[PDB]
């Protein structure tokens, strides 16, 4: 806000793998405070992702995430009479937040039976460089490219 930049709050890592960003992922995925249900969904999705990828769950999750992380995004400035979408580079924490949020919102729109299956399919397509999440990534990249003139 205006006066003080607050200090970053700590998050304890997930029990099964001890990862910080995976714990962040389950926090993003959770709805109505049901962390246990969210944990079951992500664990099932990772366990089937391990089979489809042949790699460990952490490495597969990370390679799937890397194809969804943006590097530049547009932010409104409006110094002129119209909306100026200025492309600004994205810091890593916000990059991870955007990637995880896009993956979750894409999985919530897929039409598969379970959320675990939806998330597993979305992660596999993301690793395979396909899907609406990476489509959103290319769209924001294309917008930042088209508006690259302002800096």
């Amino acid at each position: 806000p205006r006066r003080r930049v607050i200090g970053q709050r700590k998050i304890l890592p997930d029990p099964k793998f001890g990862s910080e960003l995976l714990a962040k992922f389950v926090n993003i995925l959770m709805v109505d405070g049901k962390k246990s249900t969210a944990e079951s969904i992500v664990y099932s999705a990772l366990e089937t992702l391990a089979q489809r990828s042949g790699k460990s769950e952490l490495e597969a999750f990370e390679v799937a995430l890397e194809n969804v992380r943006p590097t530049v995004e547009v932010k409104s400035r409006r110094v002129g009479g119209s909306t100026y979408q200025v492309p600004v580079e994205v810091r890593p924490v916000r990059r991870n937040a955007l990637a995880m949020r896009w993956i979750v919102e894409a999985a919530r729109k897929r039409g598969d039976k379970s959320m675990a299956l939806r998330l597993a399919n979305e992660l596999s397509d993301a690793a395979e460089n396909k899907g609406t999440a990476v489509k959103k990534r290319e769209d924001v990249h294309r917008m930042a490219e088209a508006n690259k003139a302002f800096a």
């Binding site: 002129g80 119209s82 003139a149 302002f150």
Partner: protein
């Protein structure tokens, strides 16, 4: 395409657009490109990035003449006052002389009236 070693680069940098034109030492144009013709229109085409892209397009459009040395004549005020010069240096040309050729009258014709915005 008769090869030429050294040339002159005229940058007509106006407020609404910029024109880059490479030529021989006698003033016969070889190629040209503009920010308005480089896929930018309106607000975008009056920015230094559009100007540098226009400079790159013009430098690419004069490759067949094999120019190495280049002296620059800059004319007019604009955002693309120096970005085009940077893009020309980065395109592989040896900038020898930089000159400003902006025309200023010695109290000649009467300019148009002031815009009441």
């Amino acid at each position: 395409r008769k090869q030429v070693s050294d040339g002159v680069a005229h940058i007509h940098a106006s407020f609404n657009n910029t024109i880059v034109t490479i030529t021989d030492r006698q003033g016969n144009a070889l190629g040209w490109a503009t920010a308005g013709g480089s896929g930018f229109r309106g607000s975008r085409k009056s920015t230094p990035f559009a100007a540098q892209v226009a400079a790159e397009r013009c430098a690419d459009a004069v490759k067949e003449y094999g120019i190495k040395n280049l002296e620059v004549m800059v004319k007019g005020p604009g955002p693309g006052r120096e970005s085009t010069i940077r893009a020309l240096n980065a395109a592989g040309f040896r900038i020898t002389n930089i000159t400003d050729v902006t025309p200023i009258p010695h109290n000649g014709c009467r300019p148009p009236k002031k815009r009441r915005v």
